Design an enzyme around this catalytic site. Structure first.
Site, short mmCIF file in Angstrom:
data_model
loop_
_atom_site.label_atom_id
_atom_site.label_comp_id
_atom_site.label_asym_id
_atom_site.label_seq_id
_atom_site.Cartn_x
_atom_site.Cartn_y
_atom_site.Cartn_z
N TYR A 212 1.26 0.85 18.96
CA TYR A 212 1.85 0.90 17.63
C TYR A 212 1.32 1.90 16.62
O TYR A 212 1.92 2.07 15.56
CB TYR A 212 1.84 -0.50 17.01
CG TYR A 212 2.72 -1.48 17.74
CD1 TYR A 212 2.26 -2.17 18.85
CD2 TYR A 212 4.05 -1.67 17.34
CE1 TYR A 212 3.10 -3.03 19.57
CE2 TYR A 212 4.89 -2.52 18.04
CZ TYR A 212 4.41 -3.19 19.16
OH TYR A 212 5.24 -4.04 19.85
N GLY B 45 1.43 5.12 15.96
CA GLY B 45 2.11 6.37 16.25
C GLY B 45 3.56 6.15 15.87
O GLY B 45 3.83 5.44 14.90
N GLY C 153 5.87 5.10 18.30
CA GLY C 153 6.35 4.03 19.16
C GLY C 153 6.55 2.70 18.45
O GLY C 153 6.06 2.48 17.34
N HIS D 22 1.38 -3.08 10.02
CA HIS D 22 1.78 -2.02 9.11
C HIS D 22 3.26 -1.69 9.30
O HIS D 22 3.98 -1.47 8.32
CB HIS D 22 0.92 -0.77 9.32
CG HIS D 22 1.07 0.26 8.25
ND1 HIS D 22 1.73 1.46 8.45
CD2 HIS D 22 0.66 0.28 6.96
CE1 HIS D 22 1.72 2.16 7.33
NE2 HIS D 22 1.08 1.47 6.41
N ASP D 23 3.72 -1.65 10.55
CA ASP D 23 5.13 -1.37 10.82
C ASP D 23 5.99 -2.48 10.22
O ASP D 23 7.03 -2.23 9.60
CB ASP D 23 5.41 -1.29 12.32
CG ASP D 23 4.74 -0.09 12.98
OD1 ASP D 23 4.63 0.97 12.34
OD2 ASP D 23 4.35 -0.21 14.16
N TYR E 263 6.21 -1.99 6.31
CA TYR E 263 7.16 -0.91 6.01
C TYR E 263 8.57 -1.34 6.38
O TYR E 263 9.54 -0.93 5.75
CB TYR E 263 6.83 0.34 6.83
CG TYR E 263 5.84 1.31 6.23
CD1 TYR E 263 4.97 0.93 5.21
CD2 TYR E 263 5.77 2.62 6.70
CE1 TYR E 263 4.05 1.82 4.68
CE2 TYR E 263 4.85 3.52 6.17
CZ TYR E 263 4.00 3.12 5.16
OH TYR E 263 3.09 4.01 4.65
N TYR F 49 2.80 8.12 -3.98
CA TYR F 49 2.31 7.12 -4.92
C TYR F 49 0.89 7.50 -5.28
O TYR F 49 0.31 8.40 -4.68
CB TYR F 49 2.36 5.71 -4.30
CG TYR F 49 1.49 5.49 -3.07
CD1 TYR F 49 0.11 5.32 -3.19
CD2 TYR F 49 2.06 5.46 -1.80
CE1 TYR F 49 -0.69 5.12 -2.06
CE2 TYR F 49 1.27 5.26 -0.67
CZ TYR F 49 -0.10 5.09 -0.80
OH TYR F 49 -0.87 4.89 0.32
N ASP G 138 -0.14 0.21 2.88
CA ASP G 138 -1.16 1.16 3.35
C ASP G 138 -2.58 0.63 3.16
O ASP G 138 -3.43 0.74 4.05
CB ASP G 138 -1.01 2.52 2.63
CG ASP G 138 0.24 3.28 3.06
OD1 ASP G 138 0.97 2.81 3.97
OD2 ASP G 138 0.51 4.35 2.49
#
Lengths: 121, 5
Positions: free
Chosen positions: A27, A29, A31, A47-48, A51, A64, A89
């Site tokens: 994850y 990257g 992918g 994190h994915d 987002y 930001y 982030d």
């Protein structure tokens, strides 16, 4: 965007986000599948998902601002999207540091074909 | 800075 997040990653881990966390596991990257390899990889998974829950925004491009206060990251106050992206982030950057302990070189430059299966958020 | 692409 990738610019701020990368600064955070360096600040929190002492590692340059690229190439240290840009080809890591399944994850960290571009992918998006399979079982995360370890704690660091799960950081990217989360994190994915973060987002992924900002449909009304542009995570990777929206710039930001933020600052450090007493050693801890502090997201400034921008648009709703800017503050939410900054928070996603921040959570990842700190997750990476908390698990530097188990960061494995063997997961760097990880082949995407070794990752299969959808893992729902 | 570098990021996790």
């Amino acid at each position: 965007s990738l610019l701020e997040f990368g600064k955070m990653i360096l600040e929190e881990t002492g590692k340059l986000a690229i190439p240290s966390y840009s080809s890591y596991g399944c994850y960290c990257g571009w992918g998006g599948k399979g079982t995360p390899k370890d704690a660091t990889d799960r950081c990217c998974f989360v994190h994915d998902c973060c987002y992924g829950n900002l449909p009304d925004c542009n995570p990777k491009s929206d710039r930001y601002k933020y600052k450090r206060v007493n050693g801890a990251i502090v997201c400034e106050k921008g648009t709703s999207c800017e503050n939410r992206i900054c928070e996603c982030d921040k959570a990842a950057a700190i997750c990476f540091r908390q698990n530097l302990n188990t960061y494995s070189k063997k997961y760097m430059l990880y082949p995407d074909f070794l990752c299969k299966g959808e893992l729902k958020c | 800075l570098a990021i996790y692409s």
